[PDB]
Structures are given as structure tokens and as C-alpha cells.
Amino acid sequence: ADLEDNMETLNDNLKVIEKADNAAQVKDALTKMRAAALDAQKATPPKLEDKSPDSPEMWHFRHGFDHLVGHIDDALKLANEGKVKEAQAAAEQLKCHCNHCHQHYR
Amino acid sequence: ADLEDNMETLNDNLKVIEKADNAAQVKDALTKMRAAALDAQKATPPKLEDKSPDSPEMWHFRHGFDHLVGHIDDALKLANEGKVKEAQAAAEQLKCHCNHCHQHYR
Numbered sequence A, B: 001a002d003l004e005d006n007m008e009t010l011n012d013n014l015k016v017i018e019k020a021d022n023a024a025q026v027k028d029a030l031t032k033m034r035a036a037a038l039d040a041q042k043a044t045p046p047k048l049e050d051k052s053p054d055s056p057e058m059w060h061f062r063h064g065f066d067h068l069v070g071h072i073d074d075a076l077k078l079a080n081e082g083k084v085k086e087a088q089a090a091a092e093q094l095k096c097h098c099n100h101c102h103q104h105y106r
């Protein structure tokens, strides 16, 4: 999927998690976010096509997705323990990853 | 100074930036936070007291300070350009760095 569709998936499912109140709902939404983040994890974005793959800017951009995926994974483990509210709080903290990357590279 | 000292310094001065009576207080606070972050990077957090310097948890702990310092430096450049409102806006987003590392290790 393209970058815009992946970002919409991340956007909407964050709210699905906030609206949820059980572990299955939160796990399902986090799983969709994980797939969306991985889909976008490798491609050079438009403001960065004039940069090497190992350039500091590309490195930080790719790190942004790797780290987002890591914390999605951590929230999933919470949901898989039935820790609904802790998983929701972890999901809310994902917004930091969103805004950090956007401020750098959007 | 120890890790508790550094964290008090980070907490007090982040609040100074939020409440600064004048623009000059923002730069002075950022300067103190930068020093505190680099000092904290050389500590071992209680929850990782077991781990050797080479452990994956200690790597991510140290890295969070490098990344915090990078964004402090971004905010300092803004302040040194006279863009003091932009610098205060950037400093507010430093809270995400606090929250992220704490989620792992506080």
C-alpha cells in the first residue's frame, strides 16, 4: 500500500484502541497498525529521495518506523496478557513517534 | 551528581521552559538539560542494575539520551537564532523523550 493509506491505517486504529474496552479489540487494532508501519518502514519518502540509504537522515527516518514497530509490539504483548488499560496507555504513547517523525520529515 | 540528581534537573528545567517569565530563561534551561542528559547517559538505572554495558537494554537507555540531546540542540539553535517561541514549542515536545525512556526503564 502507498504511504498515505498506511498513515491513514495508523491514524484510524489509534482511535479504535481509544474507543475499545476489551483485549481482543485492542489486539486487533494494534495488529493492523503493525502491518501498516512495516509496509512503510523501508521506502525513501519524498523529501528524502536526494539522500543515500545510509545517510543520517534516512537512518533516522527508518529508525522511526523500526522504533514505532517495537512499541506497537510492546503494546501487543500487553493486550495479549489481557492488560487492556495498560495496552491502551501504551498505544496513546505511540503519538510521540508519530509527531517526532512528522516534525523531522513531513 | 547521580541519576536522581540529573532527573530532578531535567524535570525542574523542563517546567522552567513551560513557565518561563522571559525568553532568556528558555535557553538557560535547555543548556542545563543538555548537561544533565549527558551525565545521566553514564549511569545505570536501578531496573537495569544487573546488566553489563553491552546489554540491549543499556544500549537503548544510552541511545535515548543521545536522541534527547539532539533535539535539545535543535531547540538551542532556534533559541540562538532568536526564534524563542519556536524554541519553547520545540522544548515542550521534549516531554515525549522523557515519557518514552520512562516507559521502558523508570
Ligand code: HEC
Binding pocket: A003, A004, A007, A008, A010, A011, A014, A045, A046, A061, A062, A063, A064, A065, A068, A094, A095, A097, A098, A099, A101, A102, A105, A106
Ligand atoms: C516516519 C518515521 C513516520 C512515522 C513514525 C509516522 N509517520 Fe505519518 N507520515 C510520515 C510521512 C513522511 C508523511 C507524509 C507522506 C507524504 O508523501 O506526504 C506522513 C503523513 C501522515 C498523515 C497524513 C496522511 C495524508 O493523507 O497525507 C497522517 C494522518 C499520519 N502520517 C499519521 C501517522 C500516525 C497516526 C503515526 C503514528 C502512530 C504516524 N503517522 C507515524 C512519516 C511518518
Ligand code: HEC
Binding pocket: B003, B004, B005, B007, B008, B010, B011, B012, B014, B045, B046, B060, B061, B062, B063, B064, B065, B068, B094, B095, B097, B098, B099, B101, B102, B105, B106
Ligand atoms: C532515558 C533515556 C531517560 C530519559 C530521556 C529521561 N529519563 Fe527520567 N528517568 C529515567 C530513569 C531510568 C529513571 C529512574 C531513576 C531511578 O533512580 O529510579 C528516571 C526517573 C526520573 C524522575 C524521578 C527521579 C527520582 O528521583 O526518582 C524524574 C522526575 C524524571 N526522570 C524526569 C525526567 C524528565 C522531565 C525527562 C525529559 C526531559 C527525563 N526524565 C528523561 C530515564 C530517563
Ligand code: NI
Binding pocket: A067, A070, A071, B060, B100, B104
Ligand atoms: Ni523504545
Ligand code: NI
Binding pocket: A060, A100, A104, B067, B070, B071
Ligand atoms: Ni529525532
